[PDB]
Design a protein around this nucleic acid. Sequence first.
RNA 1: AGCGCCGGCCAACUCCGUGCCAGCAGCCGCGGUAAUACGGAGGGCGCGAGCGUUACCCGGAUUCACUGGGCGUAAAGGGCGUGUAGGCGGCCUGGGGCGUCCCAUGUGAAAGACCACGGCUCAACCGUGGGGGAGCGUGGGAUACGCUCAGGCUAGACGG
RNA 2: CUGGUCCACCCGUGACGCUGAGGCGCGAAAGCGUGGGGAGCAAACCGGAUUAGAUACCCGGGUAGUCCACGCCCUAAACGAUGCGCGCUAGGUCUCUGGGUCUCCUGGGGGCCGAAGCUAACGCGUUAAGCGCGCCGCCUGGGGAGUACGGCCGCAAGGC
Lengths: 208, 234, 138, 150
Amino acid sequence: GRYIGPVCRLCRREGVKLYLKGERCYSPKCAMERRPYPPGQHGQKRARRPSDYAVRLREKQKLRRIYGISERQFRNLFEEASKKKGVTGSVFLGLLESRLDNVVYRLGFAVSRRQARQLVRHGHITVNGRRVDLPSYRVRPGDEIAVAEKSRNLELIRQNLEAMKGRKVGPWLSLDVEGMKGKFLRLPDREDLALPVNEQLVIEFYSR
Amino acid sequence: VKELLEAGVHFGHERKRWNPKFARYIYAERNGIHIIDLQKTMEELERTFRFIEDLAMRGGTILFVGTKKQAQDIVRMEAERAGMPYVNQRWLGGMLTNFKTISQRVHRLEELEALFASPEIEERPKKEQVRLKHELERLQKYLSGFRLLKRLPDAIFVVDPTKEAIAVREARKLFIPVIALADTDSDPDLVDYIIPGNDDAIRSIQLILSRAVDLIIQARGGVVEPSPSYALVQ
Amino acid sequence: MLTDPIADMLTRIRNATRVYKESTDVPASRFKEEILRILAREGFIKGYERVDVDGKPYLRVYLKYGPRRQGPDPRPEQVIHHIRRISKPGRRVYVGVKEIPRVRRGLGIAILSTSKGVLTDREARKLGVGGELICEVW
Amino acid sequence: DFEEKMILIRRTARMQAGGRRFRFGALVVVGDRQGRVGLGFGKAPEVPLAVQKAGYYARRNMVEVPLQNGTIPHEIEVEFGASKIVLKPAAPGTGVIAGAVPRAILELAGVTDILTKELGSRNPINIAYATMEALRQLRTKADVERLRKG
RNA sequence: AGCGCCGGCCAACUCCGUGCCAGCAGCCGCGGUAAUACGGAGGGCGCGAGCGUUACCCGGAUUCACUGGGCGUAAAGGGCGUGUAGGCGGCCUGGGGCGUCCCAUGUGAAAGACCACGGCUCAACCGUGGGGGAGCGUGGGAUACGCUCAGGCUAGACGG
RNA sequence: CUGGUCCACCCGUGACGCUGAGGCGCGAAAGCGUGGGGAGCAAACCGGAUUAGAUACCCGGGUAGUCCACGCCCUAAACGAUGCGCGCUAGGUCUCUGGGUCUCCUGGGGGCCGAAGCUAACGCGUUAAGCGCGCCGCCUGGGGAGUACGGCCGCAAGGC
Ligand SMILES: [K+]
Ligand SMILES: [K+]
Ligand SMILES: [K+]
Ligand SMILES: [K+]
Ligand SMILES: [Mg+2]
Ligand SMILES: [Mg+2]
Ligand SMILES: [Mg+2]
Ligand SMILES: [Mg+2]
Ligand SMILES: [Mg+2]
Ligand SMILES: [Mg+2]
Ligand SMILES: [Mg+2]
Ligand SMILES: [Mg+2]
Ligand SMILES: [Mg+2]
Ligand SMILES: [Mg+2]
Ligand SMILES: [Mg+2]
Ligand SMILES: [Mg+2]
Ligand SMILES: [Mg+2]
Ligand SMILES: [Mg+2]
Ligand SMILES: [Mg+2]
Ligand SMILES: [Mg+2]
Ligand SMILES: [Mg+2]
Ligand SMILES: [Mg+2]
Ligand SMILES: [Mg+2]
Ligand SMILES: [Mg+2]
Ligand SMILES: [Mg+2]
Ligand SMILES: [Mg+2]
Ligand SMILES: [Mg+2]
Ligand SMILES: [Mg+2]
Ligand SMILES: [Mg+2]
Ligand SMILES: [Mg+2]
Ligand SMILES: [Mg+2]
Ligand SMILES: [Mg+2]
Ligand SMILES: [Mg+2]
Ligand SMILES: [Mg+2]
Ligand SMILES: [Mg+2]
Ligand SMILES: [Mg+2]
Ligand SMILES: [Mg+2]
Ligand SMILES: [Mg+2]
Ligand SMILES: [Mg+2]
Ligand SMILES: [Mg+2]
Ligand SMILES: [Mg+2]
Ligand SMILES: [Mg+2]
Ligand SMILES: [Mg+2]
Ligand SMILES: [Mg+2]
Ligand SMILES: [Mg+2]
Ligand SMILES: [Mg+2]
Ligand SMILES: [Mg+2]
Ligand SMILES: [Mg+2]
Ligand SMILES: [Mg+2]
Ligand SMILES: [Mg+2]
Ligand SMILES: [Mg+2]
Ligand SMILES: [Mg+2]
Ligand SMILES: [Mg+2]
Ligand SMILES: [Mg+2]
Ligand SMILES: [Mg+2]
Ligand SMILES: [Mg+2]
Ligand SMILES: [Mg+2]
Ligand SMILES: [Mg+2]
Ligand SMILES: [Mg+2]
Ligand SMILES: [Mg+2]
Ligand SMILES: [Mg+2]
Ligand SMILES: [Mg+2]
Ligand SMILES: [Mg+2]
Ligand SMILES: [Mg+2]
Ligand SMILES: [Mg+2]
Ligand SMILES: [Zn+2]
């Protein structure tokens, strides 16, 4: 069971706003807005110079807490990444962006990743035509990620897919706001992304 | 500037206790003394004087260094025959290496010379008229040749490098070229532009530094008469 | 008695260049001469020449260095920075062409002795053959 | 322009009648991440003055690292005192695999991929110097060429 | 929704209780009243159907060092010879090819591992295909080095 | 009576070489056996002092022993606390011992100081602790312990 607890608190521990809520982390309320210092009774005290370790950790904690993936899950990927050919850093990110639950979010069918996940666990999603409820399912390039033929009518699907009308999206993706379907065109490149995370440090955290 | 058969002075110097390295410049062994091969003395002269004109005709400051009492004067003279600074008393540790600091002394020097020419001379207890006079006394003993240095030199002219090793070492470190009239006991390698020959014996120090300062005047443009320090060879 | 003449040669060369000698002699032998051809060709040494010191045949090895350097210690760079014996009596070292070493990513060399003659690691690879890994130089 | 990373700061002690009288030593690396680093070890009565003095000594002690796409042109081992350091070239994606001391130096020299190993005495100060010296001894084909060309 | 941590190593601090006690403790070490180290609480860090603990193997440990260590004063040169076996062996030529090197070829069960595609909605799991050195056997080839047999030589050694 | 060794001449042999597990021999002092010897010295011991108390240091005596022969023991701060051989790598100075044309040159030893270099440092530095090759011996945290057990050796003490 992926985390499941106060999130606009983790953003606070990372000193950088994380989109764990979606549209509230946009409207002067992500807490990071007027209260960006870490959580707990000691949040406003001066931070002692972080150990090399500390940095490499909190960093990984950002990158992971973003996609809301468990350490076990997370670690397996990084390993799979290390093994594969090519710059482990980037590749690792490509794999992270290939998680169905994530693409669903990146297409706007859902606001946040936590919500994007649930839409998958409830079959409201469809890869290449068939239903898929594995949020960790890996979307390969060429796959069409649509909305349950019988879920296009769902209230929530309307809003999100509506606000998606007229709104450019990921250069490796393509949203056909009409049939409520999308298309994973290519594995994003580090360039394609703008994540507040230096993967280098992550690779270093595991290097230890 | 020039000269060839100079066996009238140089060559052969130092007993038999040399430095193996300076062996390239030795001609033969005579009467327990090493006789320098002048051909090479000459070759180095050219090579070196050439570097002299270089610095000369560009406005480059050459710092002269000679404490060896066998030339402590020849230096302070030929050196004055050019805006070239000189050190003939005691090479103070860190003049180049700690130049910034050692110059604060130069400031206090000329500054004291002020006080000793103003209404404040005969002012305050003569207990200060003693301490301050002595202060100027010493400053004027050493820094009276070093005062002409606003910045680090562009070369160093050392008489006996072995003797002025502390100077050479400071130069070397600051990549400041090292011009030196070294000999038998000295280490060649430590000197960039060498002039192998008697580092001792006034008749030798005078001749060399002489023509050297001539070429400095000439090269930089000024044309001057023969050296006003040939009387010192007495 | 000399136990490893090749190692002795490698050393005379090593020893002489550290004091920056002009030349330096080593008792002559065909094999040594073969090593020298390579050192020469590769440009680690100005060259070498046969000679007859005291009746017996030697090999003047003309060492070579870099230019004078600045700052304290003007001593030039060595052309032969490293030169070490690999194979040795009582522990000979052999290699297949597939197992020939790449000394300092090519910036260096390794002299093997093969049934096709003495050759650098490249030469050896070229004629696709291995042998006794005589020494390395760089 | 230049970046500084503090390698270590220690509080040495000396004896006097009355008691111990302290000092602080600081190791600082300074690099442009463009193939230029400097090491400085400054000591002073206070930690700050120490650090500052160290930074200042570092810039006076620079090395031109022959970067060839985030890595070193070739491998080298340098022993400084009883500390030995092993530097090995690495393909991109590898990263900087090193202890905290060599890392700081390597990273500011603008190295991005390198294999490393601390052998012998792992005294920070001495490992640091072994490193700078290793970097300082690095050569390039271009260099070997001019050298053996003659 | 639990479990372990928050003195340093090692991510995470504050109050009360207790006063060399009760207790903690992987190592260094904490506790004799104002304990970030004991017990509680509030916070916080780390994982999460799991988290800790003990046991055992490899690692870090170039701390048995072949790669890759050492022995003057830190374990560590034998009290000194003589010499057996063994290890090692100047310069030149020739024969043989033992070591060494090179082609080719036969072995090298499947499975596993690696790579690529595939089947269970994914994965774990599974299938198909692809690569496979090494190690030995065989056939042919090379001869610089090492070995061996022949001859020669004086620079090692030994004689006068 | 006898071992080693150094120099000169470059006369003879043609690697006949290096190292060396076991083995064998040598091996200070004390100690052991048999028999001699015994001046001086001196464990033990007998006394006198000192002292809080001295089974001590100081003083007076004094046996083994110290000395010899033959046999045994086999240890040590048996030390340069550095195994043996060979080649290579600035010099200065003193000294012992050869040969030479005898200021000096050239060998073989003994000391200092020092190039390069090496070393944790002290230091080492053509007597290496430098650069290399060959072979032997040995080390692997402290205590337990050079102990226990076993074997071997010894008259024993005890040694390995
Ligand atoms: K070194
Ligand atoms: K011993
Ligand atoms: K043959
Ligand atoms: K026993
Ligand atoms: Mg990878
Ligand atoms: Mg001076
Ligand atoms: Mg002189
Ligand atoms: Mg060698
Ligand atoms: Mg070498
Ligand atoms: Mg090897
Ligand atoms: Mg401190
Ligand atoms: Mg460079
Ligand atoms: Mg070492
Ligand atoms: Mg250690
Ligand atoms: Mg912490
Ligand atoms: Mg506890
Ligand atoms: Mg309290
Ligand atoms: Mg507490
Ligand atoms: Mg604790
Ligand atoms: Mg507590
Ligand atoms: Mg699970
Ligand atoms: Mg272990
Ligand atoms: Mg190991
Ligand atoms: Mg161990
Ligand atoms: Mg080894
Ligand atoms: Mg060790
Ligand atoms: Mg001891
Ligand atoms: Mg010892
Ligand atoms: Mg000892
Ligand atoms: Mg011994
Ligand atoms: Mg003995
Ligand atoms: Mg042979
Ligand atoms: Mg096969
Ligand atoms: Mg196979
Ligand atoms: Mg198989
Ligand atoms: Mg599939
Ligand atoms: Mg298969
Ligand atoms: Mg023969
Ligand atoms: Mg003869
Ligand atoms: Mg004959
Ligand atoms: Mg022997
Ligand atoms: Mg034998
Ligand atoms: Mg005895
Ligand atoms: Mg006796
Ligand atoms: Mg008796
Ligand atoms: Mg008596
Ligand atoms: Mg008493
Ligand atoms: Mg009494
Ligand atoms: Mg008595
Ligand atoms: Mg003995
Ligand atoms: Mg002794
Ligand atoms: Mg031995
Ligand atoms: Mg001597
Ligand atoms: Mg001597
Ligand atoms: Mg020390
Ligand atoms: Mg010395
Ligand atoms: Mg030696
Ligand atoms: Mg040593
Ligand atoms: Mg032993
Ligand atoms: Mg134990
Ligand atoms: Mg023990
Ligand atoms: Mg013991
Ligand atoms: Mg004993
Ligand atoms: Mg018995
Ligand atoms: Mg005993
Ligand atoms: Zn938020």
